[model samples]
Target: GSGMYRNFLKRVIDILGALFLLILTSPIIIATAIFIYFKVSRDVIFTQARPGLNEKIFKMYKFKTMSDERDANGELLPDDQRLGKFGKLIRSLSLDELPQLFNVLKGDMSFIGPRPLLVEYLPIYNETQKHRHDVRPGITGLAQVNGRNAISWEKKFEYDVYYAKNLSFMLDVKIALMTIEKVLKTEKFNGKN
Candidate 1:
């Protein structure tokens, strides 16, 4: 992974790719942000700190999963179960991912790389799992193309670390095409974990 492309040209590609997508989807992005502001919550985006390259922290952005109701003790329910109908529609369609292009443009992410997971997972990450942080995090990842959350966490980390070691032009292209196909087909999100 130590090469000119990974270190240099990859970022350049990310910038151009992000810029193109941000423009191409700007209209849709605008509509969704507006639609969700009232329907989901007043916050247009849910910003959370996720670990990036070398485990650096950055505020990762996505559409908010709105739920204010709680259990008997006042704790909110599980995150996956919290989304209402409209939130589900947006997440299922991946309109929630639109804001991450800005993350790519701003150097917090890449168009292709290991997906940034919850920062809370940091303490539990073993040495091998931490390998995924060797490069920039991504909007989509090799593990995503493989099985997303359907696969076991161990298998997902295996794919991520392999990707950290083996990112290349052709590999990224293959993943991108496969990702588009999957997204187009609207694969069900397995939110287990």
Candidate 2:
């Protein structure tokens, strides 16, 4: 019952906070948009279909931080290859993810929960892992602070489940603080723990 109530409160917080950020940061967003337009191209945003709470699908939006360069086979090149130095700098500064605050405002995400992943991974999760879908996804979460993309998938899931099991106000605050640190330092989870 507490868990259900907690989720309810979380949704309310997400909605209000997201709305606040969207309105408050409108100027910064516009500035970034104009910069991206001139520095990169007209495609200022990147959108992808991602799995949300309870495995629901939604189009997630973010600032475009990579070029659309293709190879001779007409296939898109690797992310690192297409991602230029300017793009990487934007990503490292987390400006690329600013658009996702809209996702939170739309109720497709939360301020703190398990980060959403690809829809293709839906079938691959074990029953235990599937529990991650029990709550709204987040822009930052325990796994993000724990390892991000640098850790093994198994370890990432372990942290996700741990967050599921121990979701609380204190834990959320801790994760939030750590997130600030991680973003400012641009630290990757590459075996540093």
Candidate 3:
């Protein structure tokens, strides 16, 4: 692994590439926000704290894709119950991830790297899985192109660790191409998790 590429070039690409993408996709982002407001929640953006490079915490953003639907008891309904057709469409098309461009611009994330999981999972990770946090989390990653949420946690971590070990410009390019293909095909996990 080239130290210069990892330490310098990657970040440069993340900054410039994210700026280009944000401008290029602005229309889609605006439309998605409007659609989400009418169909899902008035709050179009969803934000959650996620661990990033070296396990540093950062607020990650995404377009809201789930309703705050609750039962009579006032407890939030299950994910499957709260995720409606429009929500599913947003997720399936990966439009919900548009806001993450801001995360990339802010340096909390990369265009390609391991996907960040819930912060609660930090304690649960074994030493090997913890390697995923050695670099910034990504909007799309090796695991995403391979199976995304369809794969098991162990398998995803394996890919994440492998990616961390083999970080390269070529690998990032490959993953980006694969991600575009996956998005166009709408390949995704079947069950709501």
Q: Which candidate gets the maximum lDDT versus the true structure?
A: 3
lDDT of 2 by residue, 55-167 (tens): 89988998887777789999988887777778777778888788899999898888998888877778778888887877678988988888746457767777788887788
The global C-alpha lDDT for each of the candidates, from Candidate 1 onward, is: 0.84, 0.81, 0.86
lDDT of 3 by residue, 57-158 (tens): 999998888889889998999998788888888888898888889999999999899988878778778889899988889988998888946456777788
Total clashing pairs for each candidate: 0, 0, 0
Candidate 3 is scored at a TM of 0.79
* lDDT tens digits by residue: candidate 1, 2-96: 78888789899999999999999999998998887777667888887889999999998887757666799989887776787888888888888
Global fold similarity of model 2 (TM-score):
0.77
Clashing pairs in 1: none
Q: Which portions of model 3 show Cα errors greater than 4 Å? A: 69-72, 77-85, 148-150, 180-193
lDDT score at residue 80, model 1, on the 0-100 scale: 74
What does the lDDT read for residue 171 in candidate 2?
85
lDDT of 3 at 172: 91
The candidate scoring highest on TM-score is: 1
In model 2, the worst 10-residue window by lDDT is 184-193
